[PDB]
Amino acid sequence: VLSAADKTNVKGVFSKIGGHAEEYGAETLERMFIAYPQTKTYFPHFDLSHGSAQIKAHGKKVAAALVEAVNHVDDIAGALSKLSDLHAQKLRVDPVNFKFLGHCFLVVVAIHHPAALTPEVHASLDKFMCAVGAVLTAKYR
Amino acid sequence: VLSAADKTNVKGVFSKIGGHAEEYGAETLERMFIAYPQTKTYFPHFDLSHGSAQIKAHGKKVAAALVEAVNHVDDIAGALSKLSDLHAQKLRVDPVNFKFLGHCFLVVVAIHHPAALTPEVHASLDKFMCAVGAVLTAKYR
Amino acid sequence: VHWTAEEKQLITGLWGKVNVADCGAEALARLLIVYPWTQRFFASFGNLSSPTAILGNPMVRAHGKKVLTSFGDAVKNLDNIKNTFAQLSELHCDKLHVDPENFRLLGDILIIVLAAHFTKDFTPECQAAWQKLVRVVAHALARKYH
Amino acid sequence: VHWTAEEKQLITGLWGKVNVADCGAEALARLLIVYPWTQRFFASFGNLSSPTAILGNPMVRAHGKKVLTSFGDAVKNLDNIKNTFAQLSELHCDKLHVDPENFRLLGDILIIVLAAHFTKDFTPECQAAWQKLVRVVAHALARKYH
Ligand code: HEM
Ligand code: HEM
Ligand code: HEM
Ligand code: HEM
């Protein structure tokens, strides 16, 4: 999992993201749907047109959960426990889809905050998204 | 990671393996080298002919480390700490190779102890090999 | 892909001995148990609630059989797998959107099931030939993605 | 693979603006830093001991450039990538035994590097076209495996 250096780095990038977490949430989803159209299948009941209220509302929630995990980096399985049941037990999201979303998020960060995403911070943020990925696909039995 | 049920299941299968861990060690490697010949590249200085003493000696050590991890299932990162530095820092083994070996081990178990490898035990043993895999590829920076 | 005379012998020789209902049912049941996200694709199969229910689900049994019998189409003509599996590629890729990694996982499970049934006779060489076959079949299934 | 008129425009239009020394160096450096097992392949490049040493290693810089300039060969003829990358496929598969998953990882990194350089102009559609290209290039590189 995450070293003290990694946790510093992740707190570092998320501080810069700050007030924009909601917009970045929406932007990450829009890029995921466009770049990996197979993800659209998990949202059949969504309006997936660009800048739809449904994407913005959902994006805000995804970003909010990421912020919450950052604020509880030492125990993310606890911070995201309710979300693991939803993603692993109920929705049964294929693990591969968490890699697509993690990658689109890193793309969004790079666009808006290129100077903050140094190679070192990149490596830490990737580990973090991987850690979140594994928690949300956990309780599979 | 591992539930109490998983730990019971892994202890369960490894008890049956018991005195044969060394032979199964050797057999797993032989199947890996044959089924995934690209793994041979990590052992250029080995005699990889069937039933070579070098494979048997190495197989014993691999099996021994698995047994040790089982005996310390609650803290495997600690049990295998020296091995993570070797595999991740020094040898820089591509993660994919741990999946190949984990799969060949499960094949060896199924051959010798088919009644012990129930679907449930299968699921637990797979998680376990995945857990060992992640520990041995950890300290990458 | 090139197949050796020995690989062909190992494949066709084991195929004649394979119980496709039994190995098929077990392979698909282990897929749903060991990799539980795969259950999403089979939601219409009814009760998938526990390992025992999955194991004794009739539609699981019957589908597992059909999966394994379609390996015979590959065995029949090993040099023409790409074309033989073109329709099933369209089905899995364009309709179902099953990520290719899952083809690999079912192949790996099939090999474990074969090993448990044939034990001693499932030599390293026989394993390697069978591993190559599930890899080739997986790749043929993923061709409508490229 | 079929390319749309828009995809071709997004690719060729961005290619003319790309600094291949700078993006190339950064992409390969981030590969070695974020996925440290990839360093094994580049042991002969000298000091790979820390992120800063990796970043300021000259052979890393120069190789990264060569990786990215070979994307121009793809851009030149988008409908003939499979054949254009046949020799490099042989190199990576038969000589180096680089597992295909690593081609995907370098592609994903290249996209992040492009995003950081072009920011605003790196629209969702431009990303998608570039993602498709690295996927196609990765698949062309992995063809000697099948
Ligand atoms: C970092 C990874 C992810 C995080 C933090 C996350 C977070 C969330 C949150 C906060 C919710 C809403 C729960 C609620 O409204 O109470 C949700 C629901 C949902 N997620 Fe995710 N998610 C992630 C990844 C994914 C991925 C990769 C997919 C599929 C491609 C996915 C599919 C869904 C679906 C279909 C819903 C329910 C939507 C609805 O009908 O309201 N999630 N997730
Ligand atoms: C469950 C996973 C694994 C375990 C438990 C394991 C265990 C071990 C052990 C006990 C040693 C010997 C250390 C010593 O002699 O002090 C070792 C060394 C080594 N391992 Fe692994 N190993 C695993 C996976 C792998 C994989 C997948 C590969 C590559 C395909 C690999 C490549 C090597 C190499 C090249 C050595 C050094 C051999 C020598 O020159 O002595 N290992 N491992
Ligand atoms: C790589 C080995 C595989 C083979 C040989 C295979 C073969 C088949 C065959 C023969 C059918 C029936 C087609 C028909 O009705 O004509 C089928 C359907 C289906 N497959 Fe697969 N398949 C494989 C992998 C997978 C995987 C990994 C998944 C997802 C986890 C999957 C999901 C499905 C689903 C949902 C259906 C339709 C179920 C139904 O409505 O009966 N398959 N496949
Ligand atoms: C998918 C994108 C990739 C492209 C376009 C690419 C392209 C190239 C090119 C143009 C060369 C020089 C060939 C020559 O000398 O004529 C090369 C060499 C090489 N590549 Fe790649 N490559 C890719 C991915 C990878 C990956 C993922 C690895 C391993 C992590 C790798 C490892 C190597 C190594 C070790 C060499 C030889 C280094 C040297 O001796 O200079 N490549 N590649």
Coordinates of N, CA, C and O in Angstrom, one line a residue, chain C residues 7-134:
Chain C
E7 N 1.7 -31.5 -30.1 CA 0.6 -30.7 -29.6 C -0.8 -31.2 -30.1 O -1.7 -31.2 -29.3
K8 N -0.8 -31.5 -31.3 CA -2.1 -32.0 -31.9 C -2.5 -33.3 -31.3 O -3.7 -33.5 -31.0
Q9 N -1.5 -34.2 -31.1 CA -1.7 -35.5 -30.4 C -2.3 -35.3 -29.0 O -3.1 -36.1 -28.5
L10 N -1.7 -34.4 -28.2 CA -2.0 -34.2 -26.8 C -3.4 -33.6 -26.7 O -4.2 -33.9 -25.8
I11 N -3.8 -32.7 -27.7 CA -5.1 -32.1 -27.7 C -6.2 -33.1 -28.1 O -7.2 -33.2 -27.4
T12 N -6.1 -33.7 -29.3 CA -7.1 -34.6 -29.8 C -7.2 -35.9 -28.9 O -8.3 -36.4 -28.7
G13 N -6.1 -36.4 -28.4 CA -6.1 -37.5 -27.5 C -6.8 -37.3 -26.1 O -7.5 -38.1 -25.7
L14 N -6.6 -36.1 -25.5 CA -7.4 -35.7 -24.3 C -8.8 -35.3 -24.6 O -9.7 -35.6 -23.8
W15 N -9.1 -34.7 -25.8 CA -10.5 -34.4 -26.1 C -11.4 -35.6 -26.1 O -12.6 -35.4 -25.8
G16 N -10.9 -36.7 -26.6 CA -11.8 -37.9 -26.7 C -12.2 -38.4 -25.3 O -13.3 -39.0 -25.2
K17 N -11.3 -38.2 -24.3 CA -11.6 -38.6 -23.0 C -12.4 -37.6 -22.1 O -12.9 -38.0 -21.1
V18 N -12.5 -36.4 -22.6 CA -13.1 -35.3 -21.8 C -14.6 -35.5 -21.6 O -15.4 -35.5 -22.6
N19 N -15.1 -35.5 -20.4 CA -16.5 -35.4 -20.1 C -16.9 -33.9 -20.1 O -16.5 -33.2 -19.2
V20 N -17.6 -33.5 -21.1 CA -17.8 -32.0 -21.4 C -19.0 -31.5 -20.5 O -19.1 -30.3 -20.3
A21 N -19.8 -32.3 -20.0 CA -20.9 -31.9 -19.1 C -20.3 -31.6 -17.8 O -20.5 -30.5 -17.1
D22 N -19.4 -32.5 -17.3 CA -18.9 -32.4 -16.0 C -17.8 -31.4 -15.9 O -17.8 -30.6 -14.9
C23 N -16.8 -31.4 -16.8 CA -15.8 -30.4 -16.8 C -16.3 -29.0 -17.1 O -15.9 -28.0 -16.5
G24 N -17.3 -29.0 -18.1 CA -17.9 -27.7 -18.5 C -18.6 -27.0 -17.3 O -18.4 -25.8 -17.1
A25 N -19.4 -27.8 -16.6 CA -20.2 -27.3 -15.4 C -19.3 -26.8 -14.3 O -19.5 -25.8 -13.7
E26 N -18.2 -27.6 -14.1 CA -17.3 -27.2 -13.0 C -16.5 -25.9 -13.4 O -16.4 -25.0 -12.6
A27 N -16.0 -25.9 -14.6 CA -15.2 -24.7 -15.1 C -16.0 -23.4 -15.0 O -15.5 -22.4 -14.5
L28 N -17.3 -23.4 -15.5 CA -18.1 -22.2 -15.4 C -18.5 -21.9 -13.9 O -18.5 -20.7 -13.5
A29 N -18.8 -22.9 -13.1 CA -19.1 -22.7 -11.7 C -17.8 -22.1 -11.0 O -18.0 -21.1 -10.2
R30 N -16.7 -22.6 -11.2 CA -15.5 -22.0 -10.6 C -15.2 -20.6 -11.1 O -14.8 -19.8 -10.3
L31 N -15.5 -20.3 -12.3 CA -15.4 -18.9 -12.8 C -16.2 -17.9 -12.0 O -15.7 -16.9 -11.5
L32 N -17.5 -18.3 -11.8 CA -18.4 -17.4 -11.0 C -18.1 -17.3 -9.6 O -18.4 -16.3 -8.9
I33 N -17.5 -18.4 -9.0 CA -17.1 -18.4 -7.6 C -15.8 -17.7 -7.4 O -15.7 -16.8 -6.5
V34 N -14.8 -18.0 -8.1 CA -13.4 -17.4 -7.9 C -13.3 -16.0 -8.4 O -12.6 -15.2 -7.8
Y35 N -14.1 -15.6 -9.4 CA -14.1 -14.2 -10.0 C -15.5 -13.7 -10.0 O -16.1 -13.5 -11.1
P36 N -16.0 -13.3 -8.9 CA -17.5 -13.0 -8.7 C -18.1 -11.9 -9.6 O -19.3 -11.9 -9.7
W37 N -17.3 -11.0 -10.2 CA -17.8 -10.0 -11.1 C -18.4 -10.6 -12.3 O -19.2 -10.0 -13.0
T38 N -17.9 -11.8 -12.7 CA -18.4 -12.5 -13.9 C -19.9 -12.9 -13.8 O -20.5 -13.2 -14.9
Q39 N -20.4 -12.9 -12.6 CA -21.8 -13.2 -12.3 C -22.8 -12.2 -13.0 O -23.9 -12.6 -13.3
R40 N -22.3 -11.0 -13.1 CA -23.1 -9.9 -13.8 C -23.6 -10.3 -15.1 O -24.7 -9.9 -15.6
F41 N -22.8 -11.1 -15.9 CA -23.1 -11.5 -17.2 C -24.2 -12.5 -17.3 O -24.8 -12.8 -18.4
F42 N -24.4 -13.2 -16.2 CA -25.2 -14.4 -16.1 C -26.4 -14.2 -15.1 O -26.9 -15.1 -14.6
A43 N -26.7 -12.9 -15.0 CA -27.8 -12.5 -14.0 C -29.1 -13.3 -14.3 O -29.7 -13.8 -13.3
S44 N -29.4 -13.5 -15.5 CA -30.6 -14.2 -16.0 C -30.6 -15.8 -15.7 O -31.6 -16.5 -16.0
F45 N -29.5 -16.3 -15.1 CA -29.4 -17.7 -14.8 C -30.0 -18.1 -13.5 O -30.0 -19.2 -13.0
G46 N -30.6 -17.1 -12.8 CA -31.3 -17.3 -11.5 C -30.4 -17.2 -10.3 O -29.7 -16.2 -10.1
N47 N -30.5 -18.2 -9.4 CA -29.8 -18.2 -8.1 C -28.3 -18.5 -8.3 O -27.8 -19.6 -8.6
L48 N -27.5 -17.4 -8.0 CA -26.1 -17.5 -8.0 C -25.5 -17.1 -6.6 O -24.4 -16.6 -6.5
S49 N -26.3 -17.3 -5.6 CA -26.2 -16.7 -4.3 C -25.1 -17.2 -3.4 O -24.5 -16.5 -2.6
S50 N -24.8 -18.5 -3.6 CA -23.7 -19.1 -2.8 C -23.0 -20.1 -3.8 O -23.5 -20.5 -4.8
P51 N -21.7 -20.5 -3.4 CA -21.1 -21.6 -4.2 C -21.9 -22.8 -4.4 O -21.9 -23.3 -5.5
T52 N -22.7 -23.3 -3.4 CA -23.5 -24.5 -3.6 C -24.7 -24.3 -4.6 O -24.9 -25.2 -5.4
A53 N -25.3 -23.1 -4.5 CA -26.4 -22.8 -5.4 C -25.9 -22.6 -6.8 O -26.6 -23.0 -7.8
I54 N -24.7 -22.0 -7.0 CA -24.0 -21.8 -8.3 C -23.7 -23.2 -8.9 O -24.0 -23.5 -10.0
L55 N -23.2 -24.1 -8.0 CA -22.8 -25.4 -8.4 C -24.0 -26.3 -8.9 O -23.8 -27.1 -9.8
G56 N -25.1 -26.1 -8.2 CA -26.3 -26.9 -8.5 C -27.4 -26.1 -9.3 O -28.5 -26.5 -9.3
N57 N -27.0 -25.0 -9.9 CA -27.8 -24.2 -10.8 C -27.8 -24.9 -12.2 O -26.7 -25.2 -12.7
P58 N -29.0 -25.3 -12.7 CA -29.1 -26.1 -13.9 C -28.6 -25.3 -15.2 O -28.0 -25.9 -16.1
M59 N -29.0 -24.0 -15.3 CA -28.5 -23.2 -16.4 C -27.0 -23.0 -16.4 O -26.4 -22.9 -17.5
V60 N -26.4 -22.9 -15.2 CA -24.9 -22.9 -15.1 C -24.4 -24.2 -15.7 O -23.6 -24.2 -16.6
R61 N -24.9 -25.3 -15.2 CA -24.5 -26.6 -15.7 C -24.6 -26.7 -17.2 O -23.6 -26.9 -17.9
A62 N -25.8 -26.3 -17.8 CA -26.0 -26.4 -19.2 C -25.2 -25.5 -20.0 O -24.6 -25.9 -21.1
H63 N -25.0 -24.2 -19.6 CA -24.1 -23.3 -20.3 C -22.7 -23.8 -20.3 O -22.0 -23.6 -21.3
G64 N -22.2 -24.3 -19.1 CA -20.8 -24.8 -19.0 C -20.5 -25.8 -20.1 O -19.4 -25.8 -20.7
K65 N -21.4 -26.8 -20.2 CA -21.4 -27.8 -21.3 C -21.2 -27.2 -22.7 O -20.3 -27.6 -23.4
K66 N -22.1 -26.2 -23.0 CA -22.0 -25.5 -24.3 C -20.7 -24.8 -24.6 O -20.2 -24.8 -25.7
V67 N -20.2 -24.1 -23.5 CA -18.8 -23.5 -23.6 C -17.8 -24.6 -24.0 O -17.0 -24.4 -25.0
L68 N -17.7 -25.7 -23.3 CA -16.7 -26.7 -23.5 C -16.9 -27.5 -24.8 O -15.9 -27.8 -25.5
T69 N -18.1 -27.7 -25.2 CA -18.4 -28.4 -26.5 C -17.9 -27.5 -27.7 O -17.6 -28.1 -28.8
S70 N -17.9 -26.2 -27.6 CA -17.5 -25.3 -28.6 C -16.0 -25.3 -28.8 O -15.4 -24.8 -29.7
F71 N -15.3 -26.0 -27.8 CA -13.8 -26.2 -27.9 C -13.5 -27.3 -28.9 O -12.4 -27.4 -29.5
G72 N -14.5 -28.2 -29.1 CA -14.4 -29.3 -30.2 C -14.4 -28.7 -31.6 O -13.7 -29.3 -32.4
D73 N -15.1 -27.6 -31.8 CA -15.0 -26.9 -33.1 C -13.6 -26.4 -33.3 O -13.1 -26.5 -34.5
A74 N -12.9 -26.0 -32.3 CA -11.4 -25.7 -32.4 C -10.6 -26.9 -32.6 O -9.7 -26.9 -33.5
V75 N -10.8 -28.0 -31.8 CA -10.1 -29.3 -32.0 C -10.2 -29.9 -33.4 O -9.3 -30.4 -33.9
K76 N -11.5 -29.9 -33.9 CA -11.8 -30.3 -35.2 C -10.8 -29.7 -36.2 O -10.2 -30.4 -37.0
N77 N -10.6 -28.4 -36.2 CA -9.7 -27.7 -37.1 C -8.9 -26.6 -36.4 O -9.3 -25.5 -36.3
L78 N -7.7 -27.0 -36.0 CA -6.8 -26.2 -35.2 C -6.1 -25.1 -36.0 O -5.7 -24.1 -35.4
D79 N -6.1 -25.2 -37.3 CA -5.4 -24.2 -38.1 C -6.4 -23.2 -38.6 O -6.1 -22.3 -39.3
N80 N -7.7 -23.4 -38.3 CA -8.8 -22.4 -38.7 C -9.6 -21.9 -37.5 O -10.8 -21.6 -37.7
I81 N -9.0 -21.7 -36.3 CA -9.7 -21.3 -35.1 C -10.2 -19.8 -35.3 O -11.4 -19.5 -34.9
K82 N -9.4 -18.9 -35.8 CA -9.7 -17.5 -36.0 C -11.1 -17.4 -36.7 O -11.9 -16.6 -36.3
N83 N -11.2 -18.1 -37.9 CA -12.5 -18.0 -38.6 C -13.7 -18.7 -38.0 O -14.8 -18.3 -38.0
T84 N -13.4 -19.9 -37.3 CA -14.4 -20.7 -36.6 C -15.1 -19.9 -35.5 O -16.2 -20.2 -35.2
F85 N -14.3 -19.0 -34.9 CA -14.8 -18.3 -33.7 C -15.2 -16.8 -34.0 O -15.3 -16.0 -33.0
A86 N -15.3 -16.5 -35.2 CA -15.6 -15.1 -35.7 C -17.0 -14.6 -35.2 O -17.1 -13.5 -34.8
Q87 N -18.0 -15.5 -35.4 CA -19.4 -15.2 -34.9 C -19.5 -15.0 -33.3 O -20.0 -14.0 -32.8
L88 N -18.9 -15.9 -32.6 CA -18.8 -15.8 -31.2 C -17.9 -14.6 -30.7 O -18.2 -14.1 -29.6
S89 N -17.0 -14.2 -31.5 CA -16.2 -13.0 -31.2 C -17.2 -11.8 -31.3 O -17.2 -10.9 -30.4
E90 N -18.0 -11.7 -32.4 CA -19.0 -10.7 -32.5 C -19.9 -10.6 -31.4 O -20.2 -9.6 -30.8
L91 N -20.4 -11.8 -31.0 CA -21.3 -11.9 -29.8 C -20.7 -11.4 -28.5 O -21.4 -10.5 -27.9
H92 N -19.6 -11.8 -28.2 CA -18.9 -11.5 -26.9 C -18.4 -10.0 -26.9 O -18.4 -9.4 -25.8
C93 N -18.0 -9.5 -28.0 CA -17.4 -8.2 -28.1 C -18.4 -7.1 -28.4 O -18.5 -6.1 -27.6
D94 N -19.2 -7.2 -29.4 CA -20.2 -6.2 -29.8 C -21.5 -6.2 -29.0 O -22.0 -5.1 -28.7
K95 N -22.0 -7.4 -28.7 CA -23.2 -7.4 -27.9 C -22.9 -7.4 -26.4 O -23.5 -6.5 -25.7
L96 N -22.1 -8.3 -25.9 CA -21.9 -8.4 -24.4 C -20.9 -7.6 -23.7 O -20.9 -7.4 -22.5
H97 N -19.9 -7.0 -24.5 CA -18.9 -6.1 -24.0 C -18.0 -6.8 -22.9 O -17.6 -6.1 -21.9
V98 N -17.8 -8.1 -23.0 CA -17.0 -8.8 -22.0 C -15.6 -8.4 -22.2 O -15.1 -8.6 -23.3
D99 N -14.9 -7.9 -21.2 CA -13.5 -7.5 -21.4 C -12.7 -8.8 -21.6 O -12.8 -9.8 -20.9
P100 N -11.8 -8.7 -22.6 CA -10.9 -9.9 -23.0 C -10.2 -10.6 -21.8 O -10.0 -11.8 -21.9
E101 N -9.9 -9.8 -20.8 CA -9.2 -10.4 -19.6 C -10.0 -11.6 -19.1 O -9.4 -12.6 -18.6
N102 N -11.3 -11.6 -19.1 CA -12.2 -12.6 -18.6 C -12.1 -13.9 -19.5 O -12.3 -15.0 -18.9
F103 N -11.7 -13.8 -20.7 CA -11.5 -15.0 -21.6 C -10.3 -15.8 -21.1 O -10.3 -17.0 -21.0
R104 N -9.2 -15.0 -20.7 CA -8.0 -15.6 -20.1 C -8.3 -16.3 -18.8 O -7.8 -17.4 -18.6
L105 N -9.2 -15.7 -17.9 CA -9.5 -16.3 -16.6 C -10.3 -17.6 -16.8 O -10.0 -18.5 -16.0
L106 N -11.2 -17.7 -17.7 CA -12.0 -18.9 -18.0 C -11.0 -20.0 -18.5 O -11.1 -21.2 -18.1
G107 N -10.2 -19.7 -19.4 CA -9.1 -20.6 -19.9 C -8.3 -21.1 -18.8 O -8.1 -22.3 -18.7
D108 N -7.8 -20.2 -17.9 CA -7.0 -20.7 -16.7 C -7.7 -21.7 -15.8 O -7.2 -22.7 -15.3
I109 N -9.0 -21.4 -15.6 CA -9.9 -22.3 -14.8 C -10.1 -23.6 -15.5 O -10.0 -24.7 -14.9
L110 N -10.4 -23.6 -16.8 CA -10.6 -24.8 -17.6 C -9.3 -25.7 -17.3 O -9.5 -26.9 -17.2
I111 N -8.1 -25.2 -17.4 CA -6.9 -26.0 -17.2 C -6.8 -26.6 -15.8 O -6.5 -27.8 -15.7
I112 N -7.2 -25.9 -14.8 CA -7.3 -26.4 -13.4 C -8.3 -27.6 -13.3 O -8.1 -28.6 -12.6
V113 N -9.4 -27.4 -14.0 CA -10.5 -28.4 -14.0 C -10.0 -29.7 -14.7 O -10.2 -30.8 -14.2
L114 N -9.3 -29.5 -15.8 CA -8.7 -30.6 -16.6 C -7.7 -31.4 -15.8 O -7.7 -32.6 -15.7
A115 N -6.8 -30.7 -15.1 CA -5.8 -31.2 -14.1 C -6.4 -32.1 -13.0 O -5.9 -33.2 -12.7
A116 N -7.5 -31.6 -12.4 CA -8.2 -32.3 -11.3 C -8.8 -33.6 -11.8 O -9.0 -34.5 -11.0
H117 N -9.2 -33.6 -13.1 CA -9.9 -34.8 -13.6 C -9.0 -35.9 -14.1 O -9.2 -37.1 -14.0
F118 N -7.9 -35.4 -14.7 CA -7.0 -36.3 -15.5 C -5.7 -36.6 -14.7 O -4.9 -37.4 -15.1
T119 N -5.6 -35.9 -13.6 CA -4.4 -35.8 -12.7 C -3.1 -36.2 -13.4 O -2.6 -35.5 -14.2
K120 N -2.6 -37.4 -13.0 CA -1.3 -38.0 -13.5 C -1.1 -37.8 -15.0 O 0.0 -37.5 -15.4
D121 N -2.1 -38.0 -15.7 CA -2.0 -38.0 -17.2 C -1.9 -36.5 -17.7 O -1.6 -36.3 -18.9
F122 N -2.2 -35.5 -16.9 CA -2.1 -34.1 -17.2 C -0.6 -33.6 -17.1 O -0.3 -32.8 -16.2
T123 N 0.2 -34.2 -17.9 CA 1.7 -33.9 -17.9 C 2.0 -32.4 -18.2 O 1.1 -31.7 -18.7
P124 N 3.2 -32.0 -17.8 CA 3.6 -30.6 -18.1 C 3.4 -30.3 -19.6 O 2.9 -29.2 -20.0
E125 N 3.7 -31.2 -20.5 CA 3.6 -31.0 -22.0 C 2.1 -31.0 -22.4 O 1.7 -30.2 -23.3
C126 N 1.2 -31.8 -21.8 CA -0.2 -31.8 -22.1 C -0.8 -30.5 -21.6 O -1.6 -29.8 -22.4
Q127 N -0.5 -30.0 -20.4 CA -0.8 -28.7 -19.9 C -0.4 -27.6 -20.9 O -1.2 -26.7 -21.2
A128 N 0.9 -27.6 -21.3 CA 1.4 -26.5 -22.2 C 0.6 -26.5 -23.5 O 0.2 -25.4 -24.0
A129 N 0.2 -27.6 -24.1 CA -0.5 -27.7 -25.3 C -1.9 -27.2 -25.1 O -2.5 -26.4 -25.9
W130 N -2.6 -27.5 -24.0 CA -3.9 -27.0 -23.6 C -3.9 -25.5 -23.3 O -4.8 -24.8 -23.7
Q131 N -2.9 -25.1 -22.5 CA -2.7 -23.6 -22.3 C -2.6 -22.8 -23.6 O -3.2 -21.7 -23.7
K132 N -1.9 -23.4 -24.6 CA -1.8 -22.7 -25.9 C -3.1 -22.6 -26.6 O -3.4 -21.6 -27.2
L133 N -3.9 -23.7 -26.5 CA -5.2 -23.7 -27.1 C -6.2 -22.7 -26.5 O -6.8 -22.0 -27.2
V134 N -6.2 -22.6 -25.2 CA -7.1 -21.6 -24.6 C -6.7 -20.2 -24.8 O -7.5 -19.3 -24.9

